[PDB]
Homo-oligomer: A and B are copies of this chain.
């Protein structure tokens, strides 16, 4: 079934590396995406070596584009509370501000 999300926004902080529960390495970052009418704060996840591009080319405040799909998941946090999240899993990340 169809599942596509496209965003352009600015990173709220420097990107990071994490490993998924299965031991898969990813890059993560949060985009502040301005509305056309205020902003939304969207957590993005990048698999494969694109994670290295993300962690080297992007920093806090960088403009980035993402083309990906929405994925849901949940987990129990440190305090023992179940957190439910919806994240953008990136098919590609575009570095719109190279200089």
Give the B-binding residues of A (Cβ under 8 A).
Answer: 1-9, 33-36, 40-43, 63, 65, 67, 69-72, 79, 81, 83-88, 92, 94, 96
Contacts and interface: CB of A to CB of B under 8 A. Distances in A.
B81 A8 contact: no
A40 B8 contact: no
Contacts of A83: 84
The complex is assembled from copies of this chain, and their number is 4
Given A8-B65, A65-B8, A81-B81, A42 B86 contact: yes
A94 B4 contact: no
Contacts of A43: 86
A53 to B, nearest CB: 11
A41 to B, nearest CB: 5
A3 B88 CA distance: 11
B40 A3 contact: yes
A71 B40 CA distance: 5
A67 B9 contact: no
